[PDB]
Design an enzyme around this catalytic site. Sequence first.
Site, PDB file in Angstrom:
ATOM      1  CD  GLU A   1      -1.743   1.447   3.120  1.00 37.93           C
ATOM      2  OE1 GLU A   1      -1.380   0.517   3.871  1.00 37.93           O
ATOM      3  OE2 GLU A   1      -2.400   2.428   3.522  1.00 37.93           O
TER       4      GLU A   1
ATOM      5  CG  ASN B   1       7.199   3.166  15.302  1.00 40.28           C
ATOM      6  OD1 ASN B   1       6.954   2.066  15.804  1.00 40.28           O
ATOM      7  ND2 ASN B   1       6.561   3.624  14.232  1.00 40.28           N
TER       8      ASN B   1
ATOM      9  CG  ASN C   1       3.245  -3.119  19.177  1.00 40.46           C
ATOM     10  OD1 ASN C   1       4.338  -2.553  19.222  1.00 40.46           O
ATOM     11  ND2 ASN C   1       2.491  -3.139  18.081  1.00 40.46           N
TER      12      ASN C   1
ATOM     13  N   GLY D   1      -0.852  -8.424   7.156  1.00 41.53           N
ATOM     14  CA  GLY D   1      -0.838  -9.335   6.024  1.00 41.53           C
ATOM     15  C   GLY D   1       0.442  -9.252   5.216  1.00 41.53           C
TER      16      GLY D   1
ATOM     17  CB  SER E   1       3.825  -6.237  11.987  1.00 40.86           C
ATOM     18  OG  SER E   1       3.101  -6.475  10.787  1.00 40.86           O
TER      19      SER E   1
ATOM     20  CD  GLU F   1      31.378 -11.022  17.519  1.00 39.38           C
ATOM     21  OE1 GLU F   1      31.773 -10.458  16.474  1.00 39.38           O
ATOM     22  OE2 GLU F   1      31.897 -10.831  18.643  1.00 39.38           O
TER      23      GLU F   1
ATOM     24  CG  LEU G   1      24.632  -9.209  10.021  1.00 36.94           C
ATOM     25  CD1 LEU G   1      23.754  -9.320   8.791  1.00 36.94           C
ATOM     26  CD2 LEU G   1      23.926  -8.449  11.126  1.00 36.94           C
TER      27      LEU G   1
HETATM   28  N1  LIG Z   1       5.260  -0.905  17.152  1.00 37.34           N
HETATM   29  C1  LIG Z   1       4.582  -0.679  16.031  1.00 37.34           C
HETATM   30  N2  LIG Z   1       3.622  -1.576  15.626  1.00 37.34           N
HETATM   31  C2  LIG Z   1       2.927  -1.355  14.490  1.00 37.34           C
HETATM   32  C3  LIG Z   1       3.165  -0.233  13.712  1.00 37.34           C
HETATM   33  N3  LIG Z   1       2.326  -0.283  12.649  1.00 37.34           N
HETATM   34  C4  LIG Z   1       1.574  -1.405  12.740  1.00 37.34           C
HETATM   35  N4  LIG Z   1       1.931  -2.070  13.886  1.00 37.34           N
HETATM   36  C5  LIG Z   1       1.405  -3.353  14.377  1.00 37.34           C
HETATM   37  O1  LIG Z   1       1.434  -4.248  13.282  1.00 37.34           O
HETATM   38  C6  LIG Z   1       0.267  -5.040  13.239  1.00 37.34           C
HETATM   39  C7  LIG Z   1      -0.426  -4.814  11.902  1.00 37.34           C
HETATM   40  O2  LIG Z   1       0.494  -5.051  10.864  1.00 37.34           O
HETATM   41  P1  LIG Z   1       0.869  -3.944   9.757  1.00 37.34           P
HETATM   42  O3  LIG Z   1       2.369  -3.788   9.641  1.00 37.34           O
HETATM   43  O4  LIG Z   1       0.213  -2.630  10.092  1.00 37.34           O
HETATM   44  O5  LIG Z   1       0.222  -4.545   8.407  1.00 37.34           O
HETATM   45  P2  LIG Z   1       1.041  -4.652   7.021  1.00 37.34           P
HETATM   46  O6  LIG Z   1       2.392  -5.293   7.233  1.00 37.34           O
HETATM   47  O7  LIG Z   1       1.170  -3.286   6.390  1.00 37.34           O
HETATM   48  O8  LIG Z   1       0.176  -5.640   6.084  1.00 37.34           O
HETATM   49  P3  LIG Z   1      -1.273  -5.284   5.465  1.00 37.34           P
HETATM   50  O9  LIG Z   1      -2.294  -6.238   6.039  1.00 37.34           O
HETATM   51  O10 LIG Z   1      -1.173  -5.487   3.975  1.00 37.34           O
HETATM   52  O11 LIG Z   1      -1.657  -3.852   5.765  1.00 37.34           O
HETATM   53  C8  LIG Z   1      -0.600  -4.618  14.407  1.00 37.34           C
HETATM   54  O12 LIG Z   1      -0.414  -5.560  15.440  1.00 37.34           O
HETATM   55  C9  LIG Z   1      -0.041  -3.273  14.822  1.00 37.34           C
HETATM   56  O13 LIG Z   1      -0.141  -3.081  16.215  1.00 37.34           O
HETATM   57  C10 LIG Z   1       4.135   0.679  14.114  1.00 37.34           C
HETATM   58  O14 LIG Z   1       4.373   1.687  13.447  1.00 37.34           O
HETATM   59  N5  LIG Z   1       4.838   0.447  15.275  1.00 37.34           N
HETATM   60 MG   LIG Z   2      -0.532  -2.179   5.668  1.00 39.09          MG
END
Ligand SMILES: Nc1nc2c(ncn2[C@@H]2O[C@H](COP(=O)(O)OP(=O)(O)OP(=O)(O)O)[C@@H](O)[C@H]2O)c(=O)[nH]1
Ligand SMILES: [Mg+2]
Lengths: 437, 54, 332, 423
Positions: free
Chosen positions: A71, A228, A206, A144, A140, A254, A252
């Site tokens: 996206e 963050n 988190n 997805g 994350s 190590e 890496l």
């Molecule tokens: N710590 C932290 N967690 C995040 C952040 N953005 C999203 N998350 C966590 O990541 C999870 C959602 O995954 P995303 O990374 O937002 O989704 P994506 O990887 O973009 O995949 P899509 O489904 O295609 O949008 C949730 O559990 C959020 O709490 C961030 O900026 N910082």
């Molecule tokens: Mg996303």
Amino acid sequence: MRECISIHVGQAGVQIGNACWELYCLEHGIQPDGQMPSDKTIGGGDDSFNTFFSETGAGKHVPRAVFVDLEPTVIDEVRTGTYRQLFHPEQLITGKEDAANNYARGHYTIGKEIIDLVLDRIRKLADQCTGLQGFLVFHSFGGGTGSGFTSLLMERLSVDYGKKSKLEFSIYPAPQVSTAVVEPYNSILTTHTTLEHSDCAFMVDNEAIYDICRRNLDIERPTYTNLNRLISQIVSSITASLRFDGALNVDLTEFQTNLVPYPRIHFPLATYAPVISAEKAYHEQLSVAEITNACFEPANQMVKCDPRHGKYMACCLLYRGDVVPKDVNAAIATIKTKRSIQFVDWCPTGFKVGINYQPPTVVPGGDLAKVQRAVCMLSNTTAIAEAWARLDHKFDLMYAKRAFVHWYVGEGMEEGEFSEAREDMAALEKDYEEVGV
Amino acid sequence: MEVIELNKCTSGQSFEVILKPPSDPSLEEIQKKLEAAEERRKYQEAELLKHLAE
Amino acid sequence: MYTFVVRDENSSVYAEVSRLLLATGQWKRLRKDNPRFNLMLGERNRLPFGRLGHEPGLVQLVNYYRGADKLCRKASLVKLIKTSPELSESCTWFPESYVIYDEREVFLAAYNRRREGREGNVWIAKSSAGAGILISSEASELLDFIDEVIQKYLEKPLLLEPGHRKFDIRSWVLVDHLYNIYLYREGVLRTSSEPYNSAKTCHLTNHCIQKENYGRYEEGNEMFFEEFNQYLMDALNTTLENSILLQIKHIIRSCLMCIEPAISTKHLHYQSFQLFGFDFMVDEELKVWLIEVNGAPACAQKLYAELCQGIVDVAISSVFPLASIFIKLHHH
Amino acid sequence: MREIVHIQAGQCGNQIGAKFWEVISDEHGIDPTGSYHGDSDLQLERINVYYNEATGNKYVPRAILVDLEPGTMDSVRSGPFGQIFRPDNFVFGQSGAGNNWAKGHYTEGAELVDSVLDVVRKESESCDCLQGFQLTHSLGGGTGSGMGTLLISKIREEYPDRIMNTFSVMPSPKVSDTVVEPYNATLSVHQLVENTDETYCIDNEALYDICFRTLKLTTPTYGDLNHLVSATMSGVTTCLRFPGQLNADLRKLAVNMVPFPRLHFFMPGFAPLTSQYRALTVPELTQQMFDSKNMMAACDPRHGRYLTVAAIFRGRMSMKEVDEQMLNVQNKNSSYFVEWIPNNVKTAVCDIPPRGLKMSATFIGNSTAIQELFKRISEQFTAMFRRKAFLHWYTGEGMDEMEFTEAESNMNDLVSEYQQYQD
Ligand SMILES: Nc1nc2c(ncn2[C@@H]2O[C@H](COP(=O)(O)OP(=O)(O)OP(=O)(O)O)[C@@H](O)[C@H]2O)c(=O)[nH]1
Ligand SMILES: [Mg+2]
Ligand SMILES: Nc1ncnc2c1ncn2[C@@H]1O[C@H](COP(=O)(O)OP(=O)(O)CP(=O)(O)O)[C@@H](O)[C@H]1O
Ligand SMILES: Nc1nc2c(ncn2[C@@H]2O[C@H](COP(=O)(O)OP(=O)(O)O)[C@@H](O)[C@H]2O)c(=O)[nH]1
Ligand SMILES: [Ca+2]
Ligand SMILES: [Ca+2]
Ligand SMILES: [Ca+2]
Ligand SMILES: [Mg+2]
Ligand SMILES: [Mg+2]
């Protein structure tokens, strides 16, 4: 000098990568336009900071980084951000529609259509490397893209860069900020298919970052920006040895040697101290003994768990600031007589210690106060299996009713991959119980 | 309480303190799995369009 | 409105505690698998401590201390007392014990120096898989029983009169979430109704073995502290507090302060409390000996009401307030 | 640029659809002529989800107006925001459907469906990345019910990988036009079970009860009923129209709300419902939002269990206090949320409140109590069908009794599927 390529996948990976590279620039004195006045070798050089930054003839220091998201709205934040001048457009890769919090959609449906494009852009960075160490993958568990496309990328990286190390910075899902109910599914699906491809993975729950921001920074409702900023401090502590002169964790390889004796048990627990609110005009600077003692408090861990009910396999102490080895040993001997620190019988009871004299850098105007010294402990505890047990329980609850399973089958995934992924996690929990008892 | 391997430089130092001595799938196989899932998607869509044609 | 779950249907103590919480009208019971609870009256085996303290907006409390099994297991207690510098192995209040599956050669080492020096060489063997216990003066007979924890059998026990009979003291101890040690002011003496013969049933004072001359002297082979203190004044010209209870409070503090760094939930994402059952022996010199610690004890029938209410007062309502029968053993 | 294509069909669909565009145009600062006259960049950040941009910085709704009678669509063109709609997007016939599902689905409607699809194609072709479609219609009439479900089936055939979303007004004997509404609704519901991903169940029985009991309106009108639907439709689309993290598009909403493909019928709720200058606190918003008296489906949530819940808070309030109250409602009534879906209640907050409210709350619940709505329709269907009453209107259009018997069986299946997950 050996180069490291950072790969940021999904919203969490991209936004965290944005916070890290901002911190890296402040730490190395790199201006947002890419210039670095302290760098006297213009257009090249093999200094320690060159493991993360390449150099153009114009004097710009370009991050060895690739940003991937299905996206475009999150990566457009980089294209128009403060540090837009650092990156060139080839490093930023966006899709049309995202994976909709569906592992199968990010791994099979959309991953198949973009995997060659991502690898090709990574290949361009590797061709600039005289001796590529490997990759650091930020993503994350619950998204997805962060779960689905990452696990495909990790498989392909093991194919195209078989001799290279791969480290992970993974965001473990917490319902207090999570955006999807199926995040336990995505977390376990991506751990199953990435497990044999990651040499060392740092999990950041988190929930833990959220409560540290509420408790220590007095943030009533922490945002991703608050989370963050703190996460980039921990990441910087871990990667500082790759970007500065030193002797501990200098490549890496190590990390695996010092933290991962058993390859499947490659999830070190990170603990960071101190976290001081910047709104405090004057806070008492904690000593070496105090910040070292705080490394054994669950309230400062990146994943909440109890290392007392578990065994240690390895333990690294990464100090930044006004720290000398004398104070470290004095603190460790004191902690040994007050804490429950049980090591496994087949490993030495000890601490690998690294000290970088430069105190931590904080983002100006941020919520973190400048401190004279800080420490990040990396310890491989069997207690981190508690996070797997939580995740697996939530998986079992939904999967017993096959809840939401049709969304994954609708993307070409077979229902058997669920049970296959779950049985792997069950084996992983069993390995922790054998090592821990 | 032994301190070993003390390496010092201008920007810091590192050492180890001991307290007690002790006591991949190929590119083809990945493409097969990706194409298998795509074919399963194509089949489910064909069944839908067959259902809608009825 | 606080919420709690019940995961131990056989707990006689917490069945009453659960009954009292419902009577207050401010506590609601949920299904056993509902995670949105404030309190867990958990199960004795494999309590999922790793899933506690992860529910946002819920202060979560559990009625067991993770790691307290080290104190409430036969072999674990012996290993803990020997290896802990706080207890120093040479503590005066624990009988000389050895663990056998290992300490086979060490057990027979002090065994030879006892029978040679004309000393009493009677030992007792037991384990956590009992209702099976063997008492003998020959080590060969004891070791043959294990092959199918050996400690010194106190050959000189204090005998109550009239009866010339053995007994043991049960003390109930409540440790709250702040690690305050509360000793229930009421204890019980589970007495043997048979005369002690140092040359079967008169040696084991269990309430199930005596019932299987039961109930002759006192009701249910249970003597409470008021009568026992009165007997100590008439027979030995001393009080229960001076002769015995000071040593009991000392042993309880020693055992619980020793494991405090390992089980304390002070800075933890969930809080713990636990009711304990200490078993003591008294010899003819009015010296108190620790026998074992029970992590899931039952209460005396006459004392269920008072103690279970005290659990709600200091252990539950202290964390979840609504709208002393204990002695606080102070410590550092 | 994640565009949505809006379709409104029939009298109810076009009257409710017109009020929807009237409401969200005001929220986004779009005047009746398509010119933006707002004071915040939050209004235009996601404006392309529902609006195209034309020459002169004009914003044209991506809406397609369908009916078999010209009447109601002439009123729309003469309405307040009538001139904002693209004139080519008015697709109407002349014969009408006579509250007859067979005429909308099989005879009169088939003659017009192709020209609607031509307009849908032209909108989708100029979409950077079409999310999917939203349809507003009633199930009790003929055009919105019969032709609306025909449209949905043909849209799925041409766009099988896009999300289909509907606001579906359920008929009720309390607010009834003809006696054949149970027939029309039962036939439509089976189409919706198969060919939509999300359906907001808007029950005219609930809308009437809220106007009569709560709002203190002795003689409620369709305009009064449509005021509640506007506020609800504005609330459930807030996450699509404004920047946010939760349920930001139609597919992520479906992944969060639909654990089983057929159980995708939602109970919407709104708060406040005042009969007015008094500021509503966050605890008050949360308690009313979950109260049955604020539900738009006329089902008692305490008679079933929540599979998934989405809550949207609008206005400037304490997000910390929002979390505390949301966590309070769940932890104080956890028996009504299924335990085999952990953390199935998701909350979103948006700073921009609706017009004339300091703050509000919108509830979207996938509850198994929604079976009461389908039971109610099924009983009214059977009461007539056991005597074949009024069937000649439909057999006269070529339908067979077997199709009615199959629709009856299909909806009883739907009720049974809800009952097994309630246990
Ligand atoms: N710590 C932290 N967690 C995040 C952040 N953005 C999203 N998350 C966590 O990541 C999870 C959602 O995954 P995303 O990374 O937002 O989704 P994506 O990887 O973009 O995949 P899509 O489904 O295609 O949008 C949730 O559990 C959020 O709490 C961030 O900026 N910082
Ligand atoms: Mg996303
Ligand atoms: N060293 C010793 N000297 C004398 N008597 C002893 C002894 N060790 C154990 N006993 C006897 O054994 C009994 C306690 O047995 P033990 O406590 O090991 O069994 P148990 O755990 O099944 C009973 P409980 O329900 O209290 O846990 C006491 O009544 C005591 O008289
Ligand atoms: N809430 C609401 N319901 C309506 C409205 N107009 C009609 N209905 C309901 O819709 C059903 C009649 O369908 P209608 O839209 O008039 O038929 P159509 O024009 O052929 O699609 C009945 O259940 C009416 O109660 C309206 O403006 N608002
Ligand atoms: Ca240089
Ligand atoms: Ca490898
Ligand atoms: Ca005609
Ligand atoms: Mg016992
Ligand atoms: Mg009409």
